[PDB]
Amino acid sequence: KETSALTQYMPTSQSLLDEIKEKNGFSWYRNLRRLQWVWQGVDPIEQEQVLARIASSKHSRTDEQWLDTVMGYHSGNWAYEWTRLGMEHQKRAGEMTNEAASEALFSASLCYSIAGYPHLKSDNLAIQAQVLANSAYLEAAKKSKYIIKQLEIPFEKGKITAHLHLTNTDKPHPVVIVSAGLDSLQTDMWRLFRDHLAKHDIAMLTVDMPSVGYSSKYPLTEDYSRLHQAVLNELFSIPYVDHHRVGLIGFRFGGNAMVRLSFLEQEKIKACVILGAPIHDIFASPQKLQQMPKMYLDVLASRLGKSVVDIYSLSGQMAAWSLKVQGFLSSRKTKVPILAMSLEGDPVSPYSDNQMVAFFSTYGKAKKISSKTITQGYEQSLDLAIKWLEDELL
Amino acid sequence: AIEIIAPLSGEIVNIEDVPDVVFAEKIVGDGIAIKPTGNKMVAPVNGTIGKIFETNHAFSIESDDGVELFVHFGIDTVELKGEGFTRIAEEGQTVKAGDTVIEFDLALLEEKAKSTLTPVVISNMDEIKELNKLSGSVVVGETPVLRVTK
């Protein structure tokens, strides 16, 4: 099939989806994250160019209202066009110096990742795109001035893959365990290291939440911070890091899990920072959930291993993903200081959520970043968040 | 002091007034935008056409001075799938300011596009010394819209 038509839906639910589409309008299946992709490294003009190749294709699409859904792995198809841009960057990496070669490879890596977005487990095109992403990321590290180690940590009769970014192997370094959202890959944050963590000599260790990316073989269960806990235990045996100076940064759902870990391992974590984290609100709102764009529902159905979806049934389960509905938030507070933030208006993460988290956290502050020039009003905040972690880790 | 000639006729607007964050926030580059009144996009400088999107609503160009420009008709116009645009020049094409790059059906566009505002920006801001923005009414291929010093 084609990405937008992988998630088996019940006839009764397929109609609500139809209703939601013709209601939002939207000329795309996937949620385009133009700004986010630019911050992670994609050239803004190449990005528009790819979208133009995709929108201008006359090949058959699953749903013509979504120029995003061309069927088949040939021109016009999402994975295909993003992969093309990825190969272009990779091919021309073949004749650059080493610093420049790596940057072209990292950029190649990102295109491959976007090519597979939102990464549904059943998407075979997205899966080999993911292989390209991993490879390109490996090669980029070889030619980098920095140290990127791919770690394998035994777990549940299987292994967890994590990437350790070090500025150097001189003195042990404070490390920050980083995890993004359900539709990301752990390798989509090279920039968070190169332009923000590396500058302070802080090591970055990325990990995929269970059911996501390298951790897709692990089901997304009640304890979905177990992998991160396992990584925390392995720290004491990694010579390059100061396992006594561990920090946490989490994006989107990744942030929910980081708060969680911050309650389960207070003694072994210095500070936690979350951004755009969906703590409670959206989870306490089945109307909204069963309204969201189909891409997001396809993602949930995929992480939850559902065989057939009943948009109504799923809206239900989701109540569990709430940290208030789980307990972590209510009576006791964690010793771990947590800085929770998100953009003004974020539907998924209202200031009221960074609110609870800040409350149930000793020395925890909730600070909103407003829309006035989203781009400017982020790098700033993001830089504060780092100085904050530089402090708490020292 | 290189003059950037209006790639299309219209009224000049601040780039930060276009209904799109990547442009408005100057992520694609810096410059101005034009409220179209005519029917064609032409090279804003003498140089080489870089890219021409497949939906025919935008193109890039590098002046022989090294300034890289990007002209994009409207906002969200990529979802019109090329409807209303006709490609004239080609990638790599050497051109003189005023040379026709694309032709467009304005009536059709003012009806189907989320917005007709057209950004014309310098994409390699890091490689230029200064940018001065002009204002007012401009006629395609004649009235300059910006002055750049590489």
UniProtKB/Swiss-Prot annotation, chain A:
Record EC number: 3.1.1.1
GO molecular function, one term: carboxylesterase activity
Thermal properties: Optimum temperature is 50 degrees Celsius.
Disulfide bonds: none
PANTHER family registered for this protein in UniProt: DIENELACTONE HYDROLASE DOMAIN-CONTAINING PROTEIN-RELATED, ESTERASE FRSA
Entry function: Catalyzes the hydrolysis of esters. In vitro, prefers short chain alkanoate ester as substrate. Displays highest activity towards p-nitrophenyl acetate (pNPA). Has weaker activity towards p-nitrophenyl butyrate (pNPB).
Protein's name in the database: Esterase FrsA
